[model samples]
Target: DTLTIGLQKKPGKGLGLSIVGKRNDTGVFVSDIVKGGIADADGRLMQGDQILMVNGEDVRNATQEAVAALLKCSLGTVTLEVGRISTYV
Candidate 1:
């Protein structure tokens, strides 16, 4: 089952987004991974990975809070579409 967790957007001192918490947008950005976390082992997930979809569902309009709720369900396989931030660069 996926856990309901989301990162809060922490604006930097300059009012810019500072990759701090989980964000649910067209892209899912991860700054870090919990030790021994399932995603860490799968290698399918990684820090700086942007999430594109969840369980075959595109999460473009999804909010961080909503994504957290999605993970609240029982543990199971969670399919996600991910992209590297650097890829866009």
Candidate 2:
């Protein structure tokens, strides 16, 4: 669950990634992606990428608000460590 994704940013723009987490834990997962958004346009992040880190800080135990806050504070390109869904049976 450690894939690095580079999300580029624009002046006065956001990453445009929507994420959620399962109850009882802090396992945040990507739930929606806005078309033409930075993350969507970049094409590396998907709907199910489990976020593990924001920048270099561990987000495994962080809440959705915390993660969102962190992302909101980021500038320039944001690096996210994520877990992609398994494609194999």
Candidate 3:
């Protein structure tokens, strides 16, 4: 699945979301979010959201370190394509 989520962070603060990636597969999952932090304030990102892309670049084959590096170097607003694991299953 594909989802478009727009987010921005404060100049001096962090994105406030933690992510975990599956080494066996191309799955990057959101582990946690800081309460009242940038991501929490956005209120769209969830603890189980799976990241598929950062900006327009596909991250399905990328490692967690690579994705973290991108997010660290990114500036201004960031766009994320995410997926959730449930379809009322």
TM-score per prediction, in order, is: 0.59, 0.86, 0.86
- Model 3 TM-score, all chains together: 0.86
Stretches of candidate 1 exceeding 4 Å from the true structure: 1-27, 87-89
Candidate 1 global lDDT: 0.49
Model 3 ranges with Cα > 4 A deviation: 87-89
**What's the C-alpha lDDT at position 26 in model 1?**
50
Ten consecutive residues with minimal summed lDDT in candidate 1?
Answer: 9-18
Between candidates 1 and 2, the one scoring higher on lDDT is 2
Tens digit of lDDT per residue, candidate 1, span 1-89?
13332232222311111123343345345566766545554555556665556677776456655655564442345556666555443
Residues 1-89, model 3: lDDT tens digits: 55788888568877999888866557678888999888898878888788888999998777778888898888888999988766463
lDDT of 2: 0.84
In order, candidate lDDTs are: 0.49, 0.84, 0.82
What are the clashing pairs of model 2? Answer: none
As a TM-score, model 2 comes out at 0.86
